[PDB]
Each structure stands twice: as C-alpha cells, then as structure tokens.
Design a protein around this ligand. Structure first.
Ligand SMILES: CN1CCN(C(=O)[C@H](CNC(=O)c2ccc(Cl)s2)NS(=O)(=O)c2cc(F)cc(N3CCCCC3=O)c2Cl)CC1
Ligand SMILES: [Ca+2]
Lengths: 234, 53
C-alpha cells in the first residue's frame, strides 16, 4: 500500500498472506470461511509451493495472532489468461480449519443483485496488504489499509493502456499518490455497509503504482459469486 | 427512491423486493431476527465485523 493507514488490532482481520518456501510473503488474500481463502489467479505462478498465514500485522515480529495453514486443494478459474489477467480469481481450500479471533475473521460474501446496486454505488472501499510502499520500493513490514474511491467505468477505460473486461473494476485516485502495489496482489477490497464489510474486489493489477492518470484494477468478485459458492462444498 | 432503494428496505444486510414487500436475508454465520430485518451473529467473530474484541 502506497500511503494510507496501518491496520490496528481487529481492523483488517480478513487479511490472508501467502508465504513461499522461504517464509516470505509474496501475495495477499481474503478469508471467506474457516476452510477457504480468496486470492488472485496470477499468485499461483509466483512460487511452486506456498502456505497461508493468518493474523499477521508485522512480518518481522511474531505477533501471537499468527497461524500458518497448508493449502489442500487449489481451485483456479479455467479461463484465466495471464496476457489480459482476465478472470483473475482463485480459491484455496485449507487442510485444517481457521480459528476465528482477534485479527482473524472471515469477510462476508455478498449477493449479486444487492452488491451491484448497494455496495458498488458507495463512495469508497478499503484495500489492505503487506505490499510495496512505493512503486520502486519494497514490501511493507506492517499491514496497511487505504480508502480507495470507486472510479467511473467510462474514465476507467480511457485511462488504461490495457483491456478492461466486464470482470474488472477501477478504484483509487487520479493524481493523489495513494494506491495498492506489488505484494498487495490477491488481497482484499472490502466495502462497508452498516458497519459490516463485504468482499467486493480482489487486488489484480495496475500500470505501476500510484501513477498520475492511472488506477488500481480489481477483479469484480460479484461476477464470480456463483463460482465461489460451488467451490465452497468440496 | 422506493423499497430496497429507500434505506435498504430497512434491512441490516441483503435486500430483495419479493413482491413489492421487502424481504431481507443475512450472510453466513448470521441469523434473521423475529423482525425479519436484523442480522444476529451465530457465535463469536462473525463475518464483516471488525474484531476490536
Ligand atoms: C506479477 N505482478 C507484477 C506486478 N503487478 C503489477 O500490476 C505491477 C505493479 N502494480 C501492481 O501490482 C498494482 C497496482 C495497483 C493495484 Cl490495485 S495492483 N504493474 S506492472 O506494470 O509492473 C505489471 C506487471 C505484470 F507482471 C503484469 C502487468 N500486466 C497488466 C495487465 C496487462 C498484462 C500485464 O502483464 C503489469 Cl501492468 C501485478 C502482477
Ligand atoms: Ca507478525
């Protein structure tokens, strides 16, 4: 996260972190239930083997909310193409259940018709992660959040040097140097309604980070709600 | 605005206009109250709520 605020105790409990073979986190995630984690599809080609850590706020210091889980069944969208990043969605079924607590909680999956009319018409959303603090920078040792406004789809298409598909949406600022970045990838974009946070987006991509006239591109989770629902059985 | 468009039909969470009349539903880990509008947590740490506890 370039700029923004840091997640205090219990503020971003749905945040998951995918850690490679050398203990280091490479991607973000979202807790959907005690067995399931939501992430971007492109995170699967980052490393050959990974696990999921929950309740982390500091990569250096062991927190006490930290717990590591092994991924059992990896489910990727069979239409994900890495040339357009279309269908950038993946589901991770864990071997052992997640204990919900301080810093560890799931995020609600919304209903398709309601979210489009209610959550998508809200002013802002919240993105969080352990990503880069600058475009050229390094991973953040601390968990950070940012209030990202929903960007009009018409302006979203005109700013992008790449295709914006139906399964994507724009969020962020025009010039204000605040955005998500590399490492935040696959992390949570949640929207608040009556002090309850619902999953709306997955951190997918952006032309660099915090560039003027560019926005954060997020996987439109609402276009995949039936697909995720099917996954959360076996 | 009308119904679900006007103040979410007075639902805590999901709203759908089921025969003009508003019918509310809740996310997993919640249960619908007797008023049919509120969402009540099943246990500790339900989805969506910040765990300041
Ligand atoms: C593998 N990983 C590399 C880093 N990455 C990027 O999008 C980078 C840095 N920016 C970001 O990660 C984000 C910025 C804003 C949000 Cl939200 S995520 N922007 S980038 O220009 O360096 C970049 C890297 C990359 F690997 C892929 C792409 N894209 C963008 C979509 C079109 C095809 C493509 O390869 C792009 Cl634009 C996500 C994917
Ligand atoms: Ca820690």
């Amino acid at each position: 996260i370039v700029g923004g605020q840091e997640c205090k105790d219990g503020e971003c409990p749905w945040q998951a972190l995918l850690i490679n073979e050398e203990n280091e986190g490479f991607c973000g995630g979202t807790i959907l239930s005690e067995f399931y984690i939501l992430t971007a599809a492109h995170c699967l080609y980052q490393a050959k083997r990974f696990k999921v850590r929950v309740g982390d706020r500091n990569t250096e210091q062991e927190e006490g909310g930290e717990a590591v889980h092994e991924v059992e069944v990896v489910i990727k969208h069979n239409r994900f193409t890495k040339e357009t990043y279309d269908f950038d969605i993946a589901v991770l079924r864990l071997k052992t259940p997640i204990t919900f607590r301080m810093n560890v909680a799931p995020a609600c999956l919304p209903e398709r018709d309601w979210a489009e009319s209610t959550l998508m018409t809200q002013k802002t959303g919240i993105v969080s992660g352990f990503g880069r603090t600058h475009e050229k920078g390094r991973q953040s040792t601390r968990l950070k959040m940012l209030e990202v406004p929903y960007v009009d789809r018409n302006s979203c298409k005109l700013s992008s040097s790449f295709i914006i598909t139906q399964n994507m949406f724009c969020a962020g600022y025009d010039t204000k140097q605040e955005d998500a970045c590399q490492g935040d990838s696959g992390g949570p974009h949640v929207t608040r309604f009556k002090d309850t946070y619902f999953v709306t987006g997955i951190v997918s991509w952006g032309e660099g980070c915090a560039r003027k006239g560019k926005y954060g591109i997020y996987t439109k989770v609402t276009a995949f709600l039936k697909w995720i629902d099917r996954s959360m059985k076996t | 605005r009308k119904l679900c468009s006007l103040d979410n039909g007075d639902c805590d969470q999901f709203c759908h206009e089921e025969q003009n009349s508003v019918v509310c539903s809740c996310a997993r880990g919640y249960t619908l109250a007797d008023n049919g509008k509120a969402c009540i947590p099943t246990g500790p740490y339900p989805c969506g709520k910040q765990t300041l506890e």
